[PDB]
């Protein structure tokens, strides 16, 4: 939602709809001035939000010789239902393998 302003008073515009033509139009509240709208959105929020996954430490990896591979529940495109996969938290791993 970008703010819009009046061309006579340069105050903030107030959206206001009369159902004579089924049309939205921005109106000013200062003098009397009105004009026709262009956009659609009356309000926009983008509310907010603009590891705690379980780890093991006793399994072989592919690249690094570590025990860790974090496992979370997934349902992949070639998988089925509940599946587990193992990629090490080391960035040397980079590889996702099935059991």
């Amino acid at each position: 939602s970008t703010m819009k302003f009046c061309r006579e008073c340069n105050n903030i515009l107030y959206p206001k709809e009369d159902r004579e033509q089924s049309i939205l139009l921005y109106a000013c509240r200062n003098c009397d001035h009105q004009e026709a709208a262009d956009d659609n959105c009356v309000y926009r929020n983008e509310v907010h939000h603009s590891p705690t996954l379980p780890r093991t430490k006793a399994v072989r990896c592919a690249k690094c010789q570590h025990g860790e591979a974090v496992f979370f529940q997934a349902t992949a495109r070639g998988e089925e239902g509940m599946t587990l996969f193992f990629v090490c938290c080391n960035p040397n791993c980079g590889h996702r393998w099935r059991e």
Binding site: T2, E17, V42, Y43, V47, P54, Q73, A74, G81, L84
Partner: protein, 194 residues
């Protein structure tokens, strides 16, 4: 908070299925781990236009249409459907106005979760309509007299849409899978020698 914890042991072996233990470890978490609606959202757009012709109601009670867009990858990651979201939203908004609350949301619409609405996002986001679900309406004030004083009443039910739960028990605060090392270095157990 010490009066609320419960430890759960799970020992049903089968002996040789090879990671049936860790599959047992996590599905019982999946039945209990709480996920909500307010976490997977991105934005929230009410808009008088784009559904003027979709407003087919003979007296024109329908003007405002609040989108609540999701993010696709988290809805596709944890295997969360879209129609069960409709199920869990509709029955909750029914079963809480059946509760003695108000008569403010009796005429809730809760239309459909579509995963592709339209080429939206006038104010700059520039995405291509990826889970824009729950495209509701709020015609409670039939023949809406004032546009701005009705938009605020479409912002007293957006919170109760955000605060609902999708997959998991509503009573559970958390659930954690930890401690692959039962030796004597850890806390008090009932059994572990084996």
């Amino acid at each position: 908070t010490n009066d609320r914890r419960v430890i759960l042991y799970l020992n049903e072996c089968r002996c040789g299925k090879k990671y049936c233990q860790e599959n047992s470890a996590y599905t019982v978490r999946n039945k209990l781990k709480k996920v909500s609606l307010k976490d997977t959202a991105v934005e929230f757009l009410v808009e008088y236009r784009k559904q003027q012709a979709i407003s087919e109601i003979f007296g024109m009670d329908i003007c405002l249409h609040g989108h609540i867009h999701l993010n696709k990858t988290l809805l596709e990651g944890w295997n969360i459907s879209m129609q069960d979201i409709l199920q869990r939203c509709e029955d909750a908004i029914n079963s809480l106005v059946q509760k003695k609350k108000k008569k403010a949301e009796d005429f809730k619409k809760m239309n459909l979760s579509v995963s592709e609405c339209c080429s939206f996002r006038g104010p700059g986001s520039s995405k291509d309509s990826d889970m824009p679900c729950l495209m509701f309406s709020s015609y409670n004030a039939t023949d809406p007299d004032l546009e701005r004083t009705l938009d605020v009443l479409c912002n007293t039910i957006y919170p109760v849409l955000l605060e609902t739960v999708i997959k998991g028990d509503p009573r559970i605060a958390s659930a954690n899978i930890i401690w692959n090392s039962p030796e004597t270095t850890t806390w008090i157990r009932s059994l572990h020698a084996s």
